Amino acid sequence: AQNPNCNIMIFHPTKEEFNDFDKYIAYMESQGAHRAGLAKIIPPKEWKARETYDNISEILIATPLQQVASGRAGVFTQYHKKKKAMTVGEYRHLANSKKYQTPPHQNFEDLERKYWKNRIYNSPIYGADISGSLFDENTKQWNLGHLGTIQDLLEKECGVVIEGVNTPYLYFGMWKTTFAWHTEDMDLYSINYLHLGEPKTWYVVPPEHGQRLERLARELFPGSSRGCGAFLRHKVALISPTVLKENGIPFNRITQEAGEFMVTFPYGYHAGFNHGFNCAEAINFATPRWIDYGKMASQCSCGEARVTFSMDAFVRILQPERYDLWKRGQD
Ligand SMILES: O=C(Cc1nn[nH]n1)N/N=C/c1ccc(Br)cc1
Ligand SMILES: [Cl-]
Ligand code: NA
Ligand code: NI
Ligand SMILES: [Zn+2]
Numbered sequence: 261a262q263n264p265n266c267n268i269m270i271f272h273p274t275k276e277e278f279n280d281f282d283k284y285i286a287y288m289e290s291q292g293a294h295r296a297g298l299a300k301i302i303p304p305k306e307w308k309a310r311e312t313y314d315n316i317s318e319i320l321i322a323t324p325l326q327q328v329a330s331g332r333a334g335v336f337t338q339y340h341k342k343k344k345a346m347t348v349g350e351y352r353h354l355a356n357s358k359k360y361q362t363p364p365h366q367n368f369e370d371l372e373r374k375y376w377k378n379r380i381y382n383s384p385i386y387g388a389d390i391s392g393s394l395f396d397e398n399t400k401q402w403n404l405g406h407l408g409t410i411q412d413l414l415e416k417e418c419g420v421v422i423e424g425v426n427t428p429y430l431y432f433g434m435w436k437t438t439f440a441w442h443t444e445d446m447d448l449y450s451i452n453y454l455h456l457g458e459p460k461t462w463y464v465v466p467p468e469h470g471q472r473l474e475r476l477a478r479e480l481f482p483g484s485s486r487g488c489g490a491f492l493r494h495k496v497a498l499i500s501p502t503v504l505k506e507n508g509i510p511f512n513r514i515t516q517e518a519g520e521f522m523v524t525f526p527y528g529y530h531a532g533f534n535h536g537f538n539c540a541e542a543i544n545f546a547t548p549r550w551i552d553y554g555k556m557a558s559q560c561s562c563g564e565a566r567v568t569f570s571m572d573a574f575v576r577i578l579q580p581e582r583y584d585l586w587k588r589g590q591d
Contacts, residue, residue, distance in 0.1 A: 263292025266466035275304040278401045297528025298464040301521040310396040317349030321387040329380040334500035355434035355537040362435040362536040376500045387432030404428045413546040424570035428543040433534035440495045441531040447557040448544040450524040458536030467527040469510045493560035526553035561589035
C-alpha cells in the first residue's frame with residue numbers, strides 16, 4: 261500500500277505529463293498522494309499561467325472581509341465582518357501598511373510561531389471568494405477555468421444531466437488571513453494555484469483520520485457543536501498544530517509558494533494562513549473516485565453554511581434521503 265504514513269507528496273510533472281489533468285490526478289493517487297489529503301504540484305519550467313501580473317490593480321474586491329477572532333491563541337473562532345469595497349491596488353497598499361504588513365522573520369517556521377502566538381490579537385482583511393480567473397485563455401495546461409465540470413462528471417458516472425455551473429474564485433490575502441478547518445462542499449477535491457506574492461501555509465488531516473479531527477472539534481467548540489452536527493462546514497474554527505499534537509491528531513503541514521499548485525483530496529480537512537500580500541485562484545473538481553465520498557458527505561442543515569446553487573443537484577441526486585432537510589436549511 262502506497263504512502264502508508266500519509267505524508268504530503270510533491271510532484272514535478274514534465275511538460276508531457278502536464279497535458280492530461282485527469283490522468284495526472286490518477287497518477288498521483290496511484291502513488292498514494294491522496295492519503296495525505298493534500299499534494300503539491302510544481303509545474304514544468306516551460307509552463308506559465310499568464311504573461312505578467314502588471315495589470316491586475318483595477319480588479320474590484322466588492323466585499324473585503326475583516327476576520328475577527330474569539331477564544332484563545334490555539335483554539336479560536338473567527339467571524340467575517342463586511343468592509344467597504346476596494347480595488348486590488350488599494351488592497352495591496354493596505355496589506356503593506358504598518359498595521360497589516362508581515363513582521364520581520366527568519367524563516368517559515370519563525371513566521372508560523374508568530375502566527376499562532378499573535379493571530380487572535382489582530383483582525384486582518386481578506387479578499388475571498390471573488391468569481392473570476394487570472395489564467396490566460398491561451399494557457400492550455402492546468403487552466404483552472406477550463407477543467408471538466410463536476411456536473412459533467414456526475415453525468416458521465418451516473419447517467420443523468422443536472423443543472424449547474426462550476427467556475428473559479430480569486431482570493432487576495434494579507435499577513436494573518438486565515439482559512440478555518442474544513443473539507444470542501446460535498447467532500448469534493450479542490451485545486452489551488454498561488455498566482456503571485458507571499459506564501460500560504462497549509463495544515464491537513466489524512467482523509468482516513470478525519471473523524472478524529474471532528475471529535476476533537478466537538479470537544480473544543482461545545483456550543484457550536486450543539487448548534488450543528490456538521491459545524492465545521494461553517495468554516496470558522498481554528499485549532500493550532502500544538503493543540504492537535506497534544507490531542508494526538510494525525511496531521512501534516514507544508515508551505516505553498518507562488519507558481520505552485522496544491523490539490524486537496526476528498527474528505528481531507530485543511531486549514532492555514534497567508535504570509536503576506538498574495539493572490540490565489542481555486543476551484544472544486546471531481547473524479548470517478550469522488551462519487552462515493554459525495555454520497556456519504558455530511559451536511560449542514562442548521563442555516564449557517566447556505567452554499568452555492570450548484571450543490572442542490574449534488575444533494576438531490578447523491579443523497580435523496582437527506583435532500584428535503586438540507587433544502588430547508590438553505591431557505
Ligand atoms: O507585499 C509584499 C510583502 C508583504 N509585506 N506585507 N505584506 N506583504 N509582497 N508582494 C509581492 C508581490 C508579488 C507580485 C506582485 Br504582481 C505584487 C506583489
Ligand atoms: Cl505577529
Ligand atoms: Na506526518
Ligand atoms: Ni478548502
Ligand atoms: Zn450548520
